[PDB]
Amino acid sequence: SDACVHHIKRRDIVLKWELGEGAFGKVFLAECHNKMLVAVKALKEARQDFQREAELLTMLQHQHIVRFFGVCTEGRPLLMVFEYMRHGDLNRFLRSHGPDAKAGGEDVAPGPLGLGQLLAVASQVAAGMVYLAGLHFVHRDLATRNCLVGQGLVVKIGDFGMSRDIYSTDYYRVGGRTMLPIRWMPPESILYRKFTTESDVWSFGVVLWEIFTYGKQPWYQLSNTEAIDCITQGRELERPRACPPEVYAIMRGCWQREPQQRHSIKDVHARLQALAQAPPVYLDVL
Numbered sequence: 001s002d003a004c005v006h007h008i009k010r011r012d013i014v015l016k017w018e019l020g021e022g023a024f025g026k027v028f029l030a031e032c033h034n035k036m037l038v039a040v041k042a043l044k045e046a047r048q049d050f051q052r053e054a055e056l057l058t059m060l061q062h063q064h065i066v067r068f069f070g071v072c073t074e075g076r077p078l079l080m081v082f083e084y085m086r087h088g089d090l091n092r093f094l095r096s097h098g099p100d101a102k103a104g105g106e107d108v109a110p111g112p113l114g115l116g117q118l119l120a121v122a123s124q125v126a127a128g129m130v131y132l133a134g135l136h137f138v139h140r141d142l143a144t145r146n147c148l149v150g151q152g153l154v155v156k157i158g159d160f161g162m163s164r165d166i167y168s169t170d171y172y173r174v175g176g177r178t179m180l181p182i183r184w185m186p187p188e189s190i191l192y193r194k195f196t197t198e199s200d201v202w203s204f205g206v207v208l209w210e211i212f213t214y215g216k217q218p219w220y221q222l223s224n225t226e227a228i229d230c231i232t233q234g235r236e237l238e239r240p241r242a243c244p245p246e247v248y249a250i251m252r253g254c255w256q257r258e259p260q261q262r263h264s265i266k267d268v269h270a271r272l273q274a275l276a277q278a279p280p281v282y283l284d285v286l
């Protein structure tokens with residue numbers, strides 16, 4: 001126990017209703033009195049994996065990492081208190097604001113999401129990955145499904161959380177047990193099965209691809225085995241229609257076969273941030 005986790009009395013937590021069910025956890029919408037709304041995670045049992053995660057969740061504090069408030073161990077089931085993100089995960093957000101579904105909102109225009117919005121969303125995910133790469137933390141399952149959207153179009157990296165139970169189609173089940181998001185995985189992670197920070201920047205290019213594709217699954221064209229091949233033979237994803245050539249260069253910069261030939265996430269974020277606050281007339285031409 002290197003760091004210490006804050007604790008929240010069970011009297012403070014008042015469960016309203018469920019937000020989703022997982023194979024190992026349950027997310028309820030609840031209130032805390034430290035009065036705001038929070039998202040609590042109930043363990044379905046793993047107690048060692050509870051404290052270990054909380055210790056790691058506490059150390060990770062940033063503007064684009066899901067805000068961890070603490071735990072509650074004064075009565076089973078054990079709880080993990082997260083902040084509430086209004087628009088759910090990024091993948092379900094992107095899809096519901098694409099040209100495919102089916103009328104404005106409070107945080108977003110009628111849609112589809114314009115270039116300025118997509119660049120804004122992309123920069124926030126990139127900014128959060130620089131922090132993780134700065135701590136040399138390796139997020140081995142980077143995708144739009146594992147990013148949350150809050151009130152005000154703020155994007156934070158959230159889940160894992162039963163993403164292998166919700167989006168089971170995004171994972172290849174290796175052997176009898178264990179799933180791999182091979183469509184988001186780099187060649188060295190498929191072949192030699194090695195994961196690094198440079199293996200994450202590959203995943204971000206795939207994440208950056210999802211954004212300008214409005215939530216579609218990468219290599220939706222293919223099956224799991226065919227997707228493995230195309231990545232193995234070094235076949236790249238084609239530039240999505242909503243993506244300008246200026247941004248597709250950033251994707252390919254994340255898709256170099258040699259992991260060290262790939263650009264740093266600090267450099268990728270630098271390009272994405274600059275394009276975000278860029279004046280209208282500069283983006284209209286893009």
Ligand SMILES: Cc1cn(-c2cc(NC(=O)c3cc4cc(c3C)C#Cc3cnc5ccc(nn35)N(C)CCNC(=O)CCCCO4)cc(C(F)(F)F)c2)cn1
Nearest residue numbers: 019020021022025027039041066084085157158159161162
């Ligand atoms: C090896 C390792 C990795 N980690 C690690 C863990 C996390 N954890 C995480 O992001 C994490 C984990 C988690 C839940 C949430 C997050 C953010 C959340 C949330 C949240 C806030 N508002 C809403 C509204 C609807 C909604 N969720 N939701 N759903 C749609 C229900 C989801 N349905 C379910 O069934 C999930 C079951 C248990 C889920 O546990 C985050 C990080 C990171 F990336 F942020 F650092 C790292 C710990 N150890």
